[PDB]
Amino acid sequence: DDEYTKLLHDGIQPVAAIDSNFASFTYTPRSLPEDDTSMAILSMLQDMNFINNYKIDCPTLARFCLMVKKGYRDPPYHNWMHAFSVSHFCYLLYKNLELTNYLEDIEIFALFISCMCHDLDHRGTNNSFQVASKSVLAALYSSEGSVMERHHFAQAIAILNTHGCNIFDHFSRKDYQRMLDLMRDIILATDLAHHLRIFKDLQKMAEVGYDRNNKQHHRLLLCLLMTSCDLSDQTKGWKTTRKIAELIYKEFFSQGDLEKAMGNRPMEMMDREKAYIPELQISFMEHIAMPIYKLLQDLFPKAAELYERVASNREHWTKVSHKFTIRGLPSNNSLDFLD
Ligand SMILES: CNC(=O)c1ccc2nc(C)c3nnc(-c4cc(OCC(C)C)ccc4Cl)n3c2c1
Numbered sequence: 230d231d232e233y234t235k236l237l238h239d240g241i242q243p244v245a246a247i248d249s250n251f252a253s254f255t256y257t258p259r260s261l262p263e264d265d266t267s268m269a270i271l272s273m274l275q276d277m278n279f280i281n282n283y284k285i286d287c288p289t290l291a292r293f294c295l296m297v298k299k300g301y302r303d304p305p306y307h308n309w310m311h312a313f314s315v316s317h318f319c320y321l322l323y324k325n326l327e328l329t330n331y332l333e334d335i336e337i338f339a340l341f342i343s344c345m346c347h348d349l350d351h352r353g354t355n356n357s358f359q360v361a362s363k364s365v366l367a368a369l370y371s372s373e374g375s376v377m378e379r380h381h382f383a384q385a386i387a388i389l390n391t392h393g394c395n396i397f398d399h400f401s402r403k404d405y406q407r408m409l410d411l412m413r414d415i416i417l418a419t420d421l422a423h424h425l426r427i428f429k430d431l432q433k434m435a436e437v438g439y440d441r442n443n444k445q446h447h448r449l450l451l452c453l454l455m456t457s458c459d460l461s462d463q464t465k466g467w468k469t470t471r472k473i474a475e476l477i478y479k480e481f482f483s484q485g486d487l488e489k490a491m492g493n494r495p496m497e498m499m500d501r502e503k504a505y506i507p508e509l510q511i512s513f514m515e516h517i518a519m520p521i522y523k524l525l526q527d528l529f530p531k532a533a534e535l536y537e538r539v540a541s542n543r544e545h546w547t548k549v550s551h552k553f554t555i556r557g558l559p560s561n562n563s564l565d566f567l568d
C-alpha cells in the first residue's frame with residue numbers, strides 16, 4: 230500500500246536517474262531492488278513515450294502495474310523479478326533496435342505489457358504437471374494445451390477488468406480488441422511448443438527477409454521478440470546465467486519432488502537424483518536459446534552481440550562442467566556422503 234502511495238504521488242523518475250547504464254544490453258535489471266521495480270516500469274513506459282502517446286491514465290497505470298506485480302507468486306524462478314527483467318529486456322530492444330522500423334507502436338506497446346503479464350500467477354510447475362496434478366487449471370485448459378499460458382492470459386484479462394486498472398479502456402473498440410488479440414497471441418507464444426511450431430516460419434521469414442507490409446511477419450516477429458525477452462537472462466554475464474540455472478533447477482526439482490510424492494516419475498530434468506545440470510543447461514542453450522538469438526541476429530544486425538554473449542555463456546558452461554565431478558575429497562575432507 231505504501232508502494233501504491235509512492236507510485237501515485239512521487240512522480241515518474243527519469244531512467245537515467247535509475248542507472249546511467251539502464252538502457253544498455255550490459256545492464257542487469259535483477260540488480261534493481263524489487264521495491265523500485267514498479268517505478269522502473271513507469272519510467273520505461275514514460276521513456277518510450279507510451280504514456281503520452283496513448284494518453285494513458287497514470288493512476289490507472291500505477292494500479293495496473295501493482296496488480297500485475299502482486300499477481301506473481303514466489304517460486305524460485307517464475308516470480309515478479311522474472312517478469313520485470315523480461316519487461317526490461319523488451320525496453321532494451323526498443324532502445325537499441327529500430328523496432329519502429331519493423332512494428333507498429335501498438336504492437337510494441339502490447340509486447341511490453343505482455344512481457345509484464347506473461348507468467349502471471351505461475352505456480353513453479355510446467356504444463357505437463359497441471360495435467361498429472363489434476364489442478365483446477367488443467368480442468369479449465371488442458372483440452373486446448375498451453376495450460377499455464379492460457380491461465381497467464383486469463384489473469385491479465387482479470388487484472389484489466391478490475392476496477393481502476395483498465396489502462397486501455399479509452400482505446401477505440403477496434404484498438405481495444407487488437408490489444409487483447411495481441412496480448413493473447415504474444416502470451417501464448419511463450420509456450421515452447423508454440424515456438425517449436427512456428428520456428429521454420431521464423432526461419433523462412435529470416436531468409437526471405439522481413440516485410441513490414443506483411444502483417445503475419447509482424448505477428449511472427451512479435452513471437453520471436455517475446456521469446457527473446459523470456460530467455461534474456463542468458464544474454465548477460467556468466468554470473469547471471471549461473472544464478473538463474475540455480476533458481477530454475479530449484480524450481481524444477483521442487484516439482485519433481487511433488488511428482489514423486491503423488492507416486493509419479495518426473496522428467497529427468499525435474500528429478501534431483503538424475504538431472505545433470507551442465508548437460509541440461511548446455512542443451513537448452515544450444516537447442517532453444519541460441520537459435521532464437523541467431524534469428525534475432527539475422528533480422529537485426531545490431532542484435533549480434535546478444536547472440537555472441539549467449540554462445541559465450543554456453544562455452545563457459547562447458548568449461549566448468551568438470552566441476553560437477555568430485556575429484557579429490559569433498560570440502561568436508563570426508564567420504565561420509567557415500568554412506
Ligand atoms: C523443456 N525444457 C524446459 O522447459 C527448460 C529447460 C531448461 C531451461 N533453462 C533455462 C535457463 C531456462 N530459462 N527459461 C526457461 C524456460 C522457458 C520457458 O518457455 C519460454 C519459451 C521461450 C520457450 C518455459 C519455462 C522455462 Cl523454465 N528455461 C529452461 C526451460
Ligand SMILES: [Mg+2]
Nearest residue numbers: 347348419420
Ligand atoms: Mg511462461
Ligand SMILES: [Zn+2]
Nearest residue numbers: 311347348459
Ligand atoms: Zn517467462
